[PDB]
């Protein structure tokens, strides 16, 4: 459990409870919650102590966020089965020039998840590029031939209101990536060919996966940058005094914190022998 310096018990417990409630919190970024950042001791405490408190807050927030790191196995299975559906529908379609059609159907056939978080967003992007090209071929519409360009990841022949609703839902997932709402099933069968319906469902699921992975990575890198900055500043400040407690604290902060595992080890080291270096931090 986190161990701040100089904070009144009410402030510590409300801060801990906010880190506990993180999933329920819409707009889940600390940068969007200045209610929490000044709780560290802004202008109330000394420089070293407020730096230490803010590093503790960022590190604990990173740990809880990494705990809630979303499992997408359900939507990954849905994506794979939808991709199989799109490939199945695509092979029967009477494309005029079957060569490019079968190339894009092959790349749509091959896509499989390799059980690693980072790879799946990029493989999903490739699969959606192929499927959108295939759907645009089916409706005999133009497509990007300029070299260096690539077909955008866009819905084919969906109505304005449904694209608007889907993009607002995706933005809601962007705000809070823990409450998954894949509920956009509203695709009536009278309009559009079956292939375009399948492609629209597939592109929706793929875009949901990509958005959630992108938001996760951006928050992860923000946390790593902030904790690295805090470690740098606090080491620079502790360097000025050569005592056992000060040297011990500098040695603890000396670790690189550019990985989630390294953040865990730094946090656990700071916690376990907190009572050695505490006297270096003034508590007024």
């Amino acid at each position: 459990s986190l161990q701040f310096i100089g904070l009144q018990r009410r402030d510590v417990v409300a801060l801990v409870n906010f880190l506990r409630h993180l999933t329920q919190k819409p707009d889940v970024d600390l940068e969007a919650h200045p209610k929490i950042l000044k709780k560290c001791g802004e202008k109330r405490l000394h420089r070293r102590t407020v730096l230490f408190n803010e590093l503790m807050l960022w590190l604990g927030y990173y740990r809880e966020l990494r705990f809630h790191n979303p499992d997408l196995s359900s939507v990954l299975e849905e994506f794979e089965v939808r991709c199989v559906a799109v490939a199945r529908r695509g092979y029967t379609y009477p494309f005029g020039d079957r060569g490019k059609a079968r190339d894009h159907l092959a790349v749509l056939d091959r896509t499989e998840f390799d059980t690693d978080v980072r790879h799946d967003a990029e493989i999903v992007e490739r699969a959606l590029v192929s499927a959108v090209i295939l759907a645009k071929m089916s409706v005999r519409e133009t497509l990007v031939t300029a070299i260096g360009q690539t077909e955008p990841i866009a819905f084919v022949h969906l109505k304005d209101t449904e694209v608007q609703r889907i993009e607002e839902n995706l933005e809601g997932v962007r705000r809070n990536m823990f409450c998954v709402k894949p509920l956009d099933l509203n695709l009536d069968r009278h309009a559009n060919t079956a292939l375009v319906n399948a492609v629209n469902k597939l592109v929706y699921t793929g875009r949901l996966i990509m958005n959630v992975r992108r938001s996760w990575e951006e928050l992860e890198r923000k946390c790593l940058a902030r904790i690295q900055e805090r470690c740098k500043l606090l080491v620079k400040e502790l360097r000025m005094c050569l005592s056992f407690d000060s040297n011990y604290c500098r040695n603890i902060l000396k670790h690189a914190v550019e990985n989630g595992d390294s953040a865990d080890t730094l946090l656990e080291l700071l916690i376990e022998d907190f009572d050695i270096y505490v006297d270096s931090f003034p508590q007024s």
Partner: protein
């Protein structure tokens, strides 16, 4: 050269302002060195300072 301009390919032609810009295949490095030796000899700097 052939180049890209707002999603089109276009042709671009510009002058080689100096002799150095000829390719190493068509005017290699050793040729430039020997030409410099010739210039130095013309200036009477063949054994240089």
């Amino acid at each position: 050269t052939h180049c890209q301009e707002n999603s089109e390919t276009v042709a671009l032609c510009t002058p080689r302002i100096v002799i150095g810009n000829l390719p190493d295949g068509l005017a290699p490095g050793p040729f430039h060195e020997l030409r410099t030796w010739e210039i130095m000899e013309h200036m009477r700097l063949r054994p240089p300072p």
